Amino acid sequence: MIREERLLKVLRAPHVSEKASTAMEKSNTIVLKVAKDATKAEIKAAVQKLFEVEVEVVNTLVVKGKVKRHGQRIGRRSDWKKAYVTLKEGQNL
Amino acid sequence: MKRTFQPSVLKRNRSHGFRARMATKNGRQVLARRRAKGRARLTVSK
Amino acid sequence: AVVKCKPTSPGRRHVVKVVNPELHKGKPFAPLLEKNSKSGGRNNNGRITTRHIGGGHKQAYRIVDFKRNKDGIPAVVERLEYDPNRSANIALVLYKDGERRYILAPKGLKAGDQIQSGVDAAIKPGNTLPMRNIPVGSTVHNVEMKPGKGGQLARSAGTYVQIVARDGAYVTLRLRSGEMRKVEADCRATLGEVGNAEHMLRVLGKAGAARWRGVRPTVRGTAMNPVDHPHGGGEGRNFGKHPVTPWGVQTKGKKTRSNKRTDKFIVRRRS
RNA sequence: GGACCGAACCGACUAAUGUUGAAAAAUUAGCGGAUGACUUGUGGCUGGGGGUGAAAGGCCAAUCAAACCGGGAGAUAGCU
RNA sequence: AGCCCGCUCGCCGGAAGACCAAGGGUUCCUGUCCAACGUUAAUCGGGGCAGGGUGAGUCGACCCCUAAGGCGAGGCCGAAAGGCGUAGUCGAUGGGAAACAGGUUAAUAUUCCUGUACUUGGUGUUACUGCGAAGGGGGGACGGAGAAGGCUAUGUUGGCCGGGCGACGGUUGUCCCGGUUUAAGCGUGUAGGCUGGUUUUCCAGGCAAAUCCGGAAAAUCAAGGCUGAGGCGUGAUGACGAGGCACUACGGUGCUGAAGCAACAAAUGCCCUGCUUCCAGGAAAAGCCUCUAAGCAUCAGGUAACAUCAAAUCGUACCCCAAACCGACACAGGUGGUCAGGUAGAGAAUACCAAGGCGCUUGAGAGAACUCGGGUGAAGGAACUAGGCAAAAUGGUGCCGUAACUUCGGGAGAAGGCACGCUGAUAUGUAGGUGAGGUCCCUCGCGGAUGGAGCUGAAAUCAGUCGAAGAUACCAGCUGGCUGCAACUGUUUAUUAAAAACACAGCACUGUGCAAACACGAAAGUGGACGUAUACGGUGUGACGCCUGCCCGGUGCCGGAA
Ligand SMILES: [K+]
Ligand SMILES: [K+]
Ligand SMILES: [K+]
Ligand SMILES: [K+]
Ligand SMILES: [K+]
Ligand SMILES: [K+]
Ligand SMILES: [K+]
Ligand SMILES: [K+]
Ligand SMILES: [K+]
Ligand SMILES: [K+]
Ligand SMILES: [K+]
Ligand SMILES: [K+]
Ligand SMILES: [K+]
Ligand SMILES: [K+]
Ligand SMILES: [K+]
Ligand SMILES: [K+]
Ligand SMILES: [K+]
Ligand SMILES: [K+]
Ligand SMILES: [K+]
Ligand SMILES: [K+]
Ligand SMILES: [K+]
Ligand SMILES: [K+]
Ligand SMILES: [K+]
Ligand SMILES: [Mg+2]
Ligand SMILES: [Mg+2]
Ligand SMILES: [Mg+2]
Ligand SMILES: [Mg+2]
Ligand SMILES: [Mg+2]
Ligand SMILES: [Mg+2]
Ligand SMILES: [Mg+2]
Ligand SMILES: [Mg+2]
Ligand SMILES: [Mg+2]
Ligand SMILES: [Mg+2]
Ligand SMILES: [Mg+2]
Ligand SMILES: [Mg+2]
Ligand SMILES: [Mg+2]
Ligand SMILES: [Mg+2]
Ligand SMILES: [Mg+2]
Ligand SMILES: [Mg+2]
Ligand SMILES: [Mg+2]
Ligand SMILES: [Mg+2]
Ligand SMILES: [Mg+2]
Ligand SMILES: [Mg+2]
Ligand SMILES: [Mg+2]
Ligand SMILES: [Mg+2]
Ligand SMILES: [Mg+2]
Ligand SMILES: [Mg+2]
Ligand SMILES: [Mg+2]
Ligand SMILES: [Mg+2]
Ligand SMILES: [Mg+2]
Ligand SMILES: [Mg+2]
Ligand SMILES: [Mg+2]
Ligand SMILES: [Mg+2]
Ligand SMILES: [Mg+2]
Ligand SMILES: [Mg+2]
Ligand SMILES: [Mg+2]
Ligand SMILES: [Mg+2]
Ligand SMILES: [Mg+2]
Ligand SMILES: [Mg+2]
Ligand SMILES: [Mg+2]
Ligand SMILES: [Mg+2]
Ligand SMILES: [Mg+2]
Ligand SMILES: [Mg+2]
Ligand SMILES: [Mg+2]
Ligand SMILES: [Mg+2]
Ligand SMILES: [Mg+2]
Ligand SMILES: [Mg+2]
Ligand SMILES: [Mg+2]
Ligand SMILES: [Mg+2]
Ligand SMILES: [Mg+2]
Ligand SMILES: [Mg+2]
Ligand SMILES: [Mg+2]
Ligand SMILES: [Mg+2]
Ligand SMILES: [Mg+2]
Ligand SMILES: [Mg+2]
Ligand SMILES: [Mg+2]
Ligand SMILES: [Mg+2]
Ligand SMILES: [Mg+2]
Ligand SMILES: [Mg+2]
Ligand SMILES: [Mg+2]
């Protein structure tokens, strides 16, 4: 069993975009920003515990951060992990 | 025409990378010199 | 059989092949093979230490029994095989107990022949005995220099040694070089001459054929610059110095043997 | 078959062009090899009086009758 | 002028197309801006700014396994630093489980969705049950060339289905246009390739053991096993599908949906890691199969079926004959692998096209000299010039014909000559290739024999016919004679020298008896070589033919020693 302490840290934010929206209303899939070191197993456990929904499967990818200038002052944004969480049919969030 | 620089990341790391430098006392002296000078980049290691 | 190629191309005009129909056409006996990767004549410093070595065909090493120490047990020659590692052919022999080994193929040996090693062996080609038990005057090959060490002398195609004398613990051998040499009488030898005597009649015929055998070109010293070789230099063809090796030692008559340890065993030098 | 003709591929014999170039070695038209001592990818080994060289003092990062970088070092300069 | 849309034109098409690895790193997509950047303008951009975008049990990495090689506990060696190396441990460019078709995004997809699969492992049952390795054996597991036969990708034509009936003479037909596609998996075990099978007994082998492998001897039976492209069936009452219909936010969404066959041609792909043949004789280790040891004994473990769970992590956008990589540039350069349609063609040459992609990021005029790249040229024809430099010329296939000389192979495509388009006939399409239905047989199947419809189809001869010209374009040898040098194919001064130089097979001299000489190395060691004088090193000469004379005073080397 994954500690609840751990599960409470792994989900960071919902991800809002046209693709995320289409994923929700076509494939019953929610898109999350999750902790960089979160595994598919942890992500599944967290969503089922914290959002109280049945998860079919988690797909994940690492987004590489862009380089961005800030008044002639350059800096690289952090890489972050995105999770496409497919909910079982009948579940809603 | 074929120029002298033909990049291979594997070859780069094996020739000049951090672990190659640490492998010998002369390599470790390179790192000491570069730290002393205050280089932002000690080696080719990415 | 020695066969001259017809001159259908300049590279073929002078080729002379040794075609032996008796040699196994199939693949070698897998349990007795090992890999043997090439050196390019470079040592463990990665430096060339013997020039003119490189390339040529890949070759597997055949484990050849030079010790011939499996005594009392007869063996039958299964087949003769080509061995790329040496000038002699080799014979796959099957011992009565089921063991297979390779041996140097003596002259005359053919598939079906019986061989044996040990003191009680018969005096027939391919049989191995201590030279104590071999008649003086006999022709032998694959001769040991130290008891139990395995054959070191007379292994190349068509070579043999003559046992000229036995005096106490030692026998005197006449080697192919002409040298008269003493060896302990407990040293084993195999009766007969090494086979494939026609080996020396081969004519490679072209530059490429030497390259297949992993020999790279020799550049003459006199073709070089002084910085490269003692013979180097000159406007046109010049020489005008005593011939030497690349390292400056005289190379036409100067003797280089220097081994006081083994001098006692040499009854007479080759010349 | 280090055979022949000929593309790919590898070379580089001639000419013109170009020479503050399109290019710090090329382009165009022709040219040689093209199953071999062939060619090529990836990785590896050889280190500077050292390597490697089918030998031209060739090549060793556009650098070679002794690489490059740092040091002895403000070498020395009866010369400008 | 340069952006977008449209119509036309031109260019590439063994690429100037499509895609991988590498290398790069957001360049990708959308909106917005045009200062700078872009060799011009720019409303455009690989430019600025903002937002979005990369979804995996099966693809790759990681992982298991090793090659060259690296490192290397102890160890050996070395003033120190260090060198070398054993056990080991790393190291791919190689070996090792498994997924396909269709659909979808502005931008990902073998990753998402739909349909249909497959692999490995952990649990739990149930039944049956000798399991067990750091050890043994097998396998994995291997070259070059050649030739076929069987196939498929693919193409062509016919049939079938849908559409058309023509801006100008003709075109309801032997007419025109388009489509005619469908996977892995599963079942079947074919063309063909290889191999005798089975049961006993015995045994100096495989570091011990072995029921395994090896060896020996009988008996018995002769077809048993293994491998295998493709086809066929199923997958698929599906998917896709030319069009049509309804909407357009004039970008394109929604709905429906015909035929979906056959013949012939056919790879450089597959069967094939095959077969034949040759000498230069062609990795390793694990996974995998099998054997036992110590050990464990109605246990663990093994095998099979079923159920269940798991298969993480990282990569995944985009560029790659390049404006994104290597070349300081948005640079005529360089960059490994895969795919490869039509007509003509021997062809991956070449011409024109397809799919697809582009018109090369200054234009507009003008129509001087001169320069560059080309076209043609009266008469002459090398008179040019250092030199026929450059140009012009030759150029194909078939048949005829072909000298000196020669190492008997050559020289030779020597030289030189003739034919060559189209139409018709032989023959409404021939010789040949392919092969259906039927027929009969059968050890009734992907079978055998015959049969020969249909399809495909050279080459020749004869007769005719058009042009100045029929290898019509592109493409595509100039030829011959005497002679120096080097035998030859090769190699070389990256970037002014390709040669007569280097190498070379062959020859000779010489050293070298193996802990070899010799070489790298204060050394240990290593190469020489897991070679052994028919071998190895050094030196000179340089195929082959005929040959290689005299001098040992000098210098060297070898030997002698009173
Ligand atoms: K041999
Ligand atoms: K030579
Ligand atoms: K000289
Ligand atoms: K040198
Ligand atoms: K010279
Ligand atoms: K000279
Ligand atoms: K390489
Ligand atoms: K130097
Ligand atoms: K450099
Ligand atoms: K346009
Ligand atoms: K403008
Ligand atoms: K991993
Ligand atoms: K498959
Ligand atoms: K992708
Ligand atoms: K581009
Ligand atoms: K003008
Ligand atoms: K020609
Ligand atoms: K000549
Ligand atoms: K000559
Ligand atoms: K040349
Ligand atoms: K040369
Ligand atoms: K003399
Ligand atoms: K003398
Ligand atoms: Mg999924
Ligand atoms: Mg992923
Ligand atoms: Mg950061
Ligand atoms: Mg040599
Ligand atoms: Mg020689
Ligand atoms: Mg020279
Ligand atoms: Mg000298
Ligand atoms: Mg002279
Ligand atoms: Mg002189
Ligand atoms: Mg000297
Ligand atoms: Mg050739
Ligand atoms: Mg060159
Ligand atoms: Mg050219
Ligand atoms: Mg050619
Ligand atoms: Mg010179
Ligand atoms: Mg250079
Ligand atoms: Mg110097
Ligand atoms: Mg000083
Ligand atoms: Mg000064
Ligand atoms: Mg324009
Ligand atoms: Mg084509
Ligand atoms: Mg990459
Ligand atoms: Mg940017
Ligand atoms: Mg863009
Ligand atoms: Mg501008
Ligand atoms: Mg941009
Ligand atoms: Mg895989
Ligand atoms: Mg070591
Ligand atoms: Mg140690
Ligand atoms: Mg490993
Ligand atoms: Mg690999
Ligand atoms: Mg894309
Ligand atoms: Mg082969
Ligand atoms: Mg077909
Ligand atoms: Mg081919
Ligand atoms: Mg992609
Ligand atoms: Mg441009
Ligand atoms: Mg370019
Ligand atoms: Mg290339
Ligand atoms: Mg072309
Ligand atoms: Mg097109
Ligand atoms: Mg003009
Ligand atoms: Mg002209
Ligand atoms: Mg004229
Ligand atoms: Mg005229
Ligand atoms: Mg004339
Ligand atoms: Mg004249
Ligand atoms: Mg004149
Ligand atoms: Mg000319
Ligand atoms: Mg011309
Ligand atoms: Mg056919
Ligand atoms: Mg003359
Ligand atoms: Mg020559
Ligand atoms: Mg040549
Ligand atoms: Mg040059
Ligand atoms: Mg040149
Ligand atoms: Mg010479």
Numbering used by the authors:
A (entry chain K): 1 to 93
B (entry chain 1): 1 to 46
C (entry chain F): 2 to 272
Article sentences:
Here, we describe a family of relatively small proline-rich cathelicidins widespread among ruminant species. These peptides, named rumicidins, inhibit the formation of the first peptide bond presumably due to interference with the accommodation of aminoacyl-tRNA into the A site of the ribosome. Our cryo-EM data reveals that rumicidins bind to the bacterial ribosome in the NPET similar to other known PrAMPs but form unique interactions with the elements of the 50S ribosomal subunit. Ribosome-targeting proline-rich antimicrobial peptides (PrAMPs) from animals can be divided into two groups based on their origin: oncocin- and apidaecin-like peptides from insects, and cathelicidins from Cetartiodactyla mammals.
Rumicidin-2 enters the exit tunnel in a reversed orientation relative to a nascent polypeptide chain and utilizes multiple hydrogen bonding, stacking and van der Waals interactions to bottle it up. Although no density could be seen for this part of the peptide, presumably due to its mobility, according to structure similarity with other peptides we assume that rumicidin-2 reaches into the A-tRNA binding pocket. The lower part of a spacer in a constriction site is formed by Trp23 and Phe24, which is a structural feature of all rumicidins. Backbone-carbonyl oxygen of Pro22 forms a hydrogen bond with the Arg61 of the ribosome protein uL4 while the aromatic ring of Trp23 forms stacking interaction with nucleotide A751 of helix H34 of 23S rRNA and, in addition, hydrogen bonds with the carbonyl oxygen of Lys90 of the ribosomal protein uL22. Phe24 stacks upon Thr65 of the ribosomal protein uL4 via C-H⋯π-interactions, narrowing down the constriction of the exit tunnel together with the Trp23. Due to high sequence resemblance with other oncocin-like peptides, the central part of rumicidin-2 (residues 12-22) almost perfectly aligns with the residues 7-17 in Bac72,5 and thus makes similar contacts with the rRNA.
